[PDB]
Amino acid sequence: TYTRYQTLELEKEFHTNHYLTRRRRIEMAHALCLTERQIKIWFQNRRMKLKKEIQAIKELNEQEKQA
Ligand SMILES: [Cl-]
Numbered sequence: 540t541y542t543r544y545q546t547l548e549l550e551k552e553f554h555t556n557h558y559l560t561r562r563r564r565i566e567m568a569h570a571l572c573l574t575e576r577q578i579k580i581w582f583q584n585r586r587m588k589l590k591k592e593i594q595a596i597k598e599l600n601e602q603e604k605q606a
């Protein structure tokens with residue numbers, strides 16, 4: 540799972556940049572005390588979450604622009 544601090548810090552980083560470099564993933568890994576894999580998955584899932592939020596709004600705006 541992910542602690543209150545890990546979540547807050549992962550979100551802070553995510554908003555700065557959705558994609559990380561291998562060097563950055565390492566930095567994050569040591570800082571948040573999560574493995575490279577735990578960071579890699581979190582970022583993939585957080586991108587998946589965003590992709591869905593963007594689509595939901597896109598289709599809400601298409602819906603609300605009728606009649
Ligand atoms: Cl906690």
Ligand SMILES: [Cl-]
Nearest residue numbers: 559564579582
């Ligand atoms: Cl990553």
